[PDB]
Amino acid sequence: SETRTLQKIREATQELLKYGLLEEASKPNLYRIVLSHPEEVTRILEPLDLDIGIDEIRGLLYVKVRLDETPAQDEWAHPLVRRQRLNLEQSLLVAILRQHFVAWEQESGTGASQAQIAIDDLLPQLQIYLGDPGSESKERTRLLTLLDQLKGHGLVTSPDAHERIVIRPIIAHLADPINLQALLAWLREQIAQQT
Amino acid sequence: SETRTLQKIREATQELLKYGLLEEASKPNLYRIVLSHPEEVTRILEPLDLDIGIDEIRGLLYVKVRLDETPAQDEWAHPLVRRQRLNLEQSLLVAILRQHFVAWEQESGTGASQAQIAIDDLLPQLQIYLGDPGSESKERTRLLTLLDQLKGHGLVTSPDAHERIVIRPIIAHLADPINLQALLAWLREQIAQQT
Amino acid sequence: KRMSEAKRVDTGALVEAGADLDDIPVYLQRLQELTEEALPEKLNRFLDY
Amino acid sequence: FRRVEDSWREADRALRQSIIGEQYHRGDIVERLLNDQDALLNTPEGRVFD
Amino acid sequence: ELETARKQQQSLQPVALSWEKYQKQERQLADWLTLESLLPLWFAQQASH
């Protein structure tokens, strides 16, 4: 009786849900299709109490919860969404990436040029606090494992041929980095005291 | 104004998605919510290329891959499903469990859920096919490995204190006799491969 | 009369069909089956085991 | 005694195997068990036990 | 189970017996109805000559 949803809208919505976040530079066709059918996409997602956030300046689409406004769960919890608490090393690396992404977006534009940094450049920032793990191979293994975990979190790309990663725009879309700022202040204070 | 789905409907569908099946005997309110707007559930899964399966004789609701304009090809390639594909020895143990289920059904009827068999009851049934590892603990480990996954698909409960399991009614449809004939044919092509 | 008497003592097989001069074939098939198995004639060896 | 246990386990295994076969009457099943019972009055182990 | 199997097998025997007996007269009836059909023709064939 009732007509089916359009094929491309269904496919793109499922694609984004699978990936959480996506780029026009990555898949421009789905990007434009969804942005031409935002009402349809949100209607597809609102029964799930989900929705999408977008950033045309950096060229990113991403999911977002659309529950009823501010229930008692300010530390929100959603059935279909299992939450995580990344570890102090993961949080440390995220803070490092946040600071250098902030710097890049000034010296290279707000996603005008995709934010980048070299492995040999990230490693010193970690070494400020963690110190030398014991060898260059150990340093690279540590940073690469953490970066891969972040990539699974949809935050960074794998290093290029020049060992330069690309930072996804989603970093700018974190909710409450004030915790990250406090954590970084604590880290710098500790290393300054422990040196 | 907005196309927001009613909160109870969203709750029921979110739970159904989270676990993929819903029994009235366990969660009657959500089951009756689903069967009060089953067309709504269909029209919400239709965007996702998914469909609602209903078996009121056993008071059960489960989600099943829909046919797109392409019948999902190998439907297990559907983007959303988190699990892998089913595969043979799981089918063997499913057949044995379904044999015991149909025996129990003839004994006391279809809609109930009291069927059970112990780890040692299971062990000979598979031991026929799988050979003897050399220790009872090893074959019990094999069986528990199978049961963990099958519980992951919702077929069985966890190994209880008595080393028994409870057959879930959904097995009536995974072991769909039409699908059993299709699998018998597939087994014949496996023979051809062996040939 | 005889079909009805058979129905009285049956358990599970004659339950299906009725009793008329057209039902007869089912009865004879059941008798043939219960003759193939030769089951009723194991009795006095099983009472030993 | 363990060797006798082996015989009875093997007989149970074979009986279940044959039951999965579609071809046996009720008589076949109920008679093969008695044949087994008399089967294990022959070997030295079974004779020892009985 | 053995006991009940024997009990059931008893009943159907006279049923088969009576079925055979009934078939006897059933096949017999055709002969005399055929005689009824044929009777006028024999008399007429004699009568013509």
UniProtKB/TrEMBL annotation, chain C:
Superkingdom as given in the UniProt entry: Bacteria
Protein name: Chromosome partition protein Smc
Interval of the full protein contained in this chain: 799 to 847 of 1095
From TrEMBL, chain D:
Recorded superkingdom: Bacteria
Protein name (Swiss-Prot/TrEMBL): DUF3375 family protein
Full protein stretch here: 199 to 248 of 498
